[PDB]
Write a protein that binds this ligand. Structure first.
Ligand SMILES: *C(=O)c1nc2c(C(=O)Nc3cc(O[C@H](C)c4c(Cl)cncc4Cl)c(C#N)cn3)cn(CCN3CCOCC3)c2cc1Br
Length: 300
């Protein structure tokens, strides 16, 4: 009963719904097979991520998903974001079809690839060598910055940029997810802990947390936290600090320490992102360039 948009509309019968991937505040995401997403190859199979309303959804849940859908249409296509592939709005439940990232989110990607502990018996010629190396970590940070730069150019604010909201493809390409979402910024439970133990308040810029102000520079703050996540290989920010203590510490201008095995260049970028005045933080364009210099200097 929603209006037909032939540009994006995809026949729902060309989808085979598979195993659920996860669920958000509004909507659930399910893995699925798509046939003929490329109209030039009608019988070609591809793996996609389908977002849909949960069971017994409210009208506001529908409005939020519709709102997300329209943002996806306007945002355009970029290598480092989750792109819209199609929609199903006609004669059936609302489907928002987007790209699927085979390796899950960036946080779990890093945590599952932490170096072998010294408790492990030396077996082979590279026993100390873990899956993750410094240039690849830098590349991950660079890709997120480029993706955010694109989103910024499209006047899009993420409001919850983090490792958990960055997805990893089969080719280890970073793709920013859930960027055009209504997140109820006027009613945030700052003490709320997710089912996986995450405290989303630890990613909020001071002007966002204290003054409910969101800009692209507030995302830059979040990017700084995301930088810390990457080079702690999926660690949780402000270790062992409860939300109540986080409040007072932030008011005192407290910042996270430099993590182990992290070069001063990158902790330098982190601290720049965490400058109190938003105009004293780098832009994403500057972050891209700065991370590019480091990346090129370690890609001989
Ligand atoms: C399809 O390529 C595919 N995807 C995954 C994912 C996965 O996370 N896919 C995914 C999730 C998306 O959003 C959800 C809500 C999400 C989750 Cl589930 C987790 N964190 C953040 C977000 Cl946004 C979106 C979107 N939009 C797109 N794609 C996870 N897996 C399994 C990972 N698996 C773990 C065990 O080792 C092997 C890898 C897959 C698999 C596949 Br085929």
């Amino acid at each position: 009963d929603l209006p037909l948009d032939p540009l994006w509309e995809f026949p729902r019968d060309r989808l085979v719904l598979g195993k659920p991937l996860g669920e958000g505040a509004f909507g659930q995401v399910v893995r699925a097979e798509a046939f003929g997403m490329d109209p030039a190859r009608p019988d070609q199979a591809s793996t996609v991520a389908v977002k849909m309303l949960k069971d017994n959804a409210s009208d506001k849940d529908l409005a939020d998903l519709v709102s997300e859908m329209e943002v996806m249409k306007l945002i355009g296509r970029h290598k480092n974001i989750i792109n819209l592939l199609g929609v199903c709005t006609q004669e059936g439940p609302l489907y928002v079809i987007m790209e699927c990232a085979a390796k899950g989110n960036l946080r779990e990607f890093l945590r599952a690839r932490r170096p072998p502990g010294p408790d492990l018996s030396p077996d082979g010629p590279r026993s100390s060598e873990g899956p993750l190396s410094f240039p690849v970590l830098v590349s991950c940070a660079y890709q997120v910055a480029r993706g955010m730069q694109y989103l910024e150019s499209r006047k899009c604010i993420h409001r919850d940029l983090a490792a958990r909201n960055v997805l990893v493809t089969e080719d280890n390409v970073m793709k920013i997810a859930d960027f055009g979402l209504a997140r109820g910024v006027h009613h945030i439970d700052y003490y709320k802990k997710t089912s996986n133990g995450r405290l989303p308040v630890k990613w909020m810029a001071p002007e966002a947390l204290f003054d409910e102000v969101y800009t692209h520079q507030s995302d830059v703050w979040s990017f700084g936290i995301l930088l810390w996540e990457i080079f702690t290989l999926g660690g949780s920010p402000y270790p062992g600090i409860p939300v109540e203590e986080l409040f007072s510490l932030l008011r005192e201008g407290h910042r996270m320490d430099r993590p182990p095995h992290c070069p001063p260049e990158l902790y330098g970028l982190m601290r720049e992102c965490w400058h109190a005045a938003p105009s004293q933080r780098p832009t994403f364009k500057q972050l891209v360039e700065a991370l590019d210099k480091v990346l090129l200097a370690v890609s001989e």
